[PDB]
Amino acid sequence: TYFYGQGEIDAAPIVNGVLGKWRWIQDVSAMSIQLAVEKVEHKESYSGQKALVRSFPIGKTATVNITLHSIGPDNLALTLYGKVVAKAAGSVTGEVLPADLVAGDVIRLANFGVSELVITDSASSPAPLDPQYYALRADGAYGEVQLLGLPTPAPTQPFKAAYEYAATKQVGMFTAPQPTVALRYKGINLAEGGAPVIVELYKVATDPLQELALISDGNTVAGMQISGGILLDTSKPDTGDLGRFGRIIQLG
Amino acid sequence: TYFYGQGEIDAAPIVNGVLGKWRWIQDVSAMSIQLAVEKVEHKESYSGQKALVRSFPIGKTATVNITLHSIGPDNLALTLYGKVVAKAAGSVTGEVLPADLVAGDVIRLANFGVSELVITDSASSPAPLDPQYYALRADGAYGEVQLLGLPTPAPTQPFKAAYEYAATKQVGMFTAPQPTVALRYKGINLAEGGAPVIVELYKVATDPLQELALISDGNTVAGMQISGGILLDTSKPDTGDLGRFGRIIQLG
Amino acid sequence: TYFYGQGEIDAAPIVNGVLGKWRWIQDVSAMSIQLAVEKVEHKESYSGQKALVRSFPIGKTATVNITLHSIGPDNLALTLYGKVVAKAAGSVTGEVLPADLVAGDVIRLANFGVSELVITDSASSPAPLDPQYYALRADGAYGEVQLLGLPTPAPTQPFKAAYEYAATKQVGMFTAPQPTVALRYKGINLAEGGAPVIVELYKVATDPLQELALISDGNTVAGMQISGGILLDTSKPDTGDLGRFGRIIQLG
Amino acid sequence: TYFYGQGEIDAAPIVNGVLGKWRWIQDVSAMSIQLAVEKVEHKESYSGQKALVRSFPIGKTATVNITLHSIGPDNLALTLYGKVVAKAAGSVTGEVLPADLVAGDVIRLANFGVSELVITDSASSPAPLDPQYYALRADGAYGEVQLLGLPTPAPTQPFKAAYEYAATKQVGMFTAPQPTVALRYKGINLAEGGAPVIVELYKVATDPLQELALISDGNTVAGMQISGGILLDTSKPDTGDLGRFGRIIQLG
Amino acid sequence: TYFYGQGEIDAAPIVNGVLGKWRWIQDVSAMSIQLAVEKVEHKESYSGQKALVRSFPIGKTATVNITLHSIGPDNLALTLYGKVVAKAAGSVTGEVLPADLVAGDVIRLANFGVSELVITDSASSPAPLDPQYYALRADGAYGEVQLLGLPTPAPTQPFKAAYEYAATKQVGMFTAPQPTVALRYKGINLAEGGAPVIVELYKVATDPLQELALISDGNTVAGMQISGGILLDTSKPDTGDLGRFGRIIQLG
Amino acid sequence: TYFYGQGEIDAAPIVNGVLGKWRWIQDVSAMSIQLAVEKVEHKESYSGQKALVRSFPIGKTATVNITLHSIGPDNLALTLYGKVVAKAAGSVTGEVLPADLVAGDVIRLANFGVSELVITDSASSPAPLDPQYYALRADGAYGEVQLLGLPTPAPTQPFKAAYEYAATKQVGMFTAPQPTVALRYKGINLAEGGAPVIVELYKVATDPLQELALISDGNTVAGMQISGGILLDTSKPDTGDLGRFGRIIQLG
């Protein structure tokens, strides 16, 4: 009869009212549910106390806050209103680098994970440049190339860079509509020897992430906090005891 | 003449004005009662001080806050505006699992506490699948089945799952009207050798739980805080010394 | 010429302007007096500074806050707008207990401090039930009886309970009008070898207790905080040096 | 050129514009002066920045906060808008005590510092009561007498109390008009070997004490905080370099 | 490329637009510059996101906060809107003391730093009073004289005091117009081996000191905080790269 | 699947929509991104709960906060709305110092980094003054010269100062329009063995620095906090999965 819960959360997106495929939202550090009710009050005046005598509720709302520490692209799509874009690995053969380059300039490439970088000189007789005259910062992860030097007989300035780029996953900002996801919290209550508890929320509309600290200070893992409103599902039976907002199952 | 109280709280629901059956609300960590009064003031002006000279009360209200650590279904019905639903244990024989299943898929079952799980293959000659090809996560408490593999001669994809499910208790969200409960606080005052004290509140209208942290951090047991207004009971005698809001009994 | 005061407070209720009988308010932990004044200001404009040049007071008010740790019925009547009700000890002979009782049911009695409990069986030949078949929780202080068992030949269900109940004192909620009490603070100033100090407040109108924690956590004694306004007494002489709000007497 | 000041404050009341007699305000723990100015701003718009270009002051005010720990009657008159009343020591011969007195009653006398208390019995033959039948609580400082017992042949109930009372000083609440006092702060700056500093405020209008804790907790001496506005004196020369609000003198 | 600055501040008053003589503002503990900008925003509505698409600034303001610990008269004139008054040392010959003086009275003199105090008796034959009959409190720094006694043949009450007073510097309250000062912050950046940095603010309008604690508690030197607005100078070239608010010079 | 990021930030100014040259913003201590959304809600009323049933977003905005500790002129131009001015080293030959100079006066020169200072006397026969009669405070970094003395035969007062000044870089206050910069955050996630992460923000409009403490206390390096709004870029494809606000690339 005491609660200290630890467990997992499964989310299923709702598209045009058809149930989606459940997925694990990965690690979650905090889950909170808050209930709000509006009440209209009636006061009697026969006792001289002008005090409250009755009240009936008019409003009913529920909010859910979730703190997730996973920065996976699947979760980014759900939290950033984005849609995942997958780019397959490939090669570049005739990319043209900026002109008027001199020692000290930093060239930014269009793709990441560059490898086997080659820069052919522009001339009737192609002459690949010596690798010792350029360096790859951040082991080519950021696609940045630094010029270390140039031969005394200055070669033709425009260059032709060819290389290989690895596959990547990208998420756009505000590129998807407001997601609607059904939530299933499967938890273990340690206070009762690890008893099972299940919480079902049929329809939830989420709110974008509020803050995202890209450069963190301290020993705390970056956290992503999402707020959402539990909407009223109109498909479930009205008279059923399961309600229309959410339900809790405890085995006993 | 000093107070440090520890005790129990009994609640009796009020339905259409007829007293209900008292029940223990289980463990309670904090109880507070607050009184609010509105006053209209009259100021004299013959002394030149334009100061207050009289005041009479117009409003009278009382609020009660209770912090309970019990997550029992009976308390969930009272705090979540829900009504308890009891499901008896039973069996399933012809549940159909999703199609196009492959290794790695997770199948969610409609009932919890699954045991003796059997998945018959779809064919003119029934052939139950080998148990080694599937696993039960969370010992079947959450009703989740993981596929470990499939025979090289891929069997018919649609499946027929049969198993046994245990009884459960469920609580809906906002599925019951605003409860009205009479409260009896029976406490022991340790400052006076454990003297008995009784507090009676005739009519209280409760407010849903504000927050419920499903995943808790630290060493603090999950707490459920409920606020309520003590309404004016119109059935008790008006001139009686017991009043109409509440009373306190101290043996002495 | 320094103040660190410890002392007692005596209160005399004011009914229709006739002085009441002084009583000690028991232990008090904190007393504070605050003065509020409203001022209307006049600004000159001949120097170019448009600054304040005069001010005269229009309003005058005084508030008093008292923290008392005594939960005595006399103080409850003063703080809860209640009136004390005394119930003398007595006996009950033919109280009828609820029907359809079975093992595990808890019966609540109308009076507290039950002793010599007897439950006669309903039949043409009265047959008191064996005491071993019932138990008294909380040594009968709360008037709760638990059924331990029933004879195999189930006796007549309706019962007739007779017992003895002790005297008690009760306080109603908001059952009395706004008290008006004159206050006398008799204190000792330790900074001057324990010099005597007296503070007189002629007329004070109190405000109900704000909070009352029935179940306390920690090592702090329950506190009852009361606010009040010091009204203007119209009976004292206007020109007298004693004023009409309050006075302080210091022997020296 | 550094300031850490400790010193004394002298106050001279202003009555109808005639200087009063300076007195020492006793111990003071904190003194603060705050300046407030109102400004009207003009913004140019030829540069496209729509930014501030000029400002001139319209308002000018100064406030002073003083924390004094002396509860002397002279300071009480200044802080409570009161006027001191001196009562000379004397005697009482025929004071009548309340009737229907019994053992346990507490009699409150009109004067403090009672000594040589005598209670003559009401009868044709006066018979002073035995001292052993009554006691003086708080060594008669509060003027409280407790009855210890009565002779079996109950004497005449009405009594005639005679005793001696000492002189006292009293202060009324809001019994004097808004004081106007000129302030002289004579301080020593320790940062410069104890250099002398003088601060003169010509006209100050004070604000009643905000809080006065009669029963104190901890090891902190009771403090009395007073706020005041420094008014504009119209008697000093307008063109003089000494101004009209206040001045500072530093010897050097 | 890191900043931890320590340095000096030079201030030059601006009178009718003509540059004043720079002076050192003495010790300064903190300097802060804040920039405020107002922006008007334009939102597009063709994407359905009703989000921000453009913004242009309309307002531009800059504020400066300085904390100085010097209480020198030159700084007092700048912070208190005062003008310094210098009084040369001199002598007094025929000052008349208050009449009706008795033992215990304290006489306040018009000048400070009194020395060689002489009080001639009023009579046809002048008779200076014995020095042993009077004392000088605070070694005459505050100009206070205490009477120790009087001869049995009471001399003529009115007195004639003559003495010597030292020179002093005084500052009036709100006796000068709103100063306008150009500021030059010459600082050393320790993070770069003590590199030089210069900050120029052409026109600043200051705000009076907010608080001045004459009697300080703790081990903290009294601080004087001044706020000011950096106005737009209309004399500098509009197209120049030095701007019109302020500039920073870093040698490198 | 966990984030603790450390990395670099590259900024490219946007002028009339043409991409600028990327530069490193130097050391950065904190980066935060916040998302704001406005929603319009629809409530049904057929269930009697008058609760939320639908919501659609109308507003979309994103803000970015960056804390940079570099006080380089390039960053000053970006944060102060300034434009860098470079002054080359040079010489001065006929600068005229203020007249009526005496011992103790401090002369401020128009340029910094003074060296080989010479002050020729005004006379028909030029006579350079002896160096021992003047001193250079702050080793001439601030361009301040102090007079140590003058010959008994007072030379001609007006002077002619010649010296050498070093090159400098200056930044004006509010001398440039609102910058628009594209941001590229290249970070390493230590939680995954140092995995690469890239964050692209296409269009950001910055807000001036709020505070700049020129004189710092403690052991904390001076910080420069800048806020900005991520605007909607209208050049990128509308249907592309990269969106129009920003994107995140994670290699995997």
Residue numbers in the entry:
A (entry chain A), B (entry chain A), C (entry chain A), D (entry chain A), E (entry chain A), F (entry chain A): 5 to 256
Q: What do the authors report?
A:
Bacteriophage Casadabanvirus JBD30, from the order Caudoviricetes, is a temperate phage that infects the bacterium Pseudomonas aeruginosa. Using its baseplate, JBD30 attaches to Pseudomonas aeruginosa via the bacterial type IV pilus, whose subsequent retraction brings the phage to the bacterial cell surface.
The tail of bacteriophage JBD30 is a right-handed six-entry helix composed of 45 discs, each built from six major tail proteins (gp44). The twist and rise in between two adjacent discs are 23.5° and 43.2 Å, respectively. The major tail protein of JBD30 consists of a central β-sandwich (residues 8–41, 62–73, 184–256), peripheral α-helix (residues 77–83), decoration domain (residues 88–175), and a long hinge loop (residues 42–62). The inner tail tube diameter, 40 Å, is defined by the β-barrel formed by 24 β-strands, to which each major tail protein contributes four β-strands. The surface is negatively charged to enable the swift passage of the DNA. The disc-to-disc contacts are mediated by the hinge loops, each of which is inserted between loops formed by residues 217–227 of two major tail proteins from an adjacent hexamer. We assume that the flexibility of the hinge loop and its interaction with the loops of adjacent major tail proteins enables the bending of the tail, similar to those of phages SPP1 and λ. The JBD30 tail contains a long density inside the tail tube, which was absent in the tail tube reconstructed from empty particles.
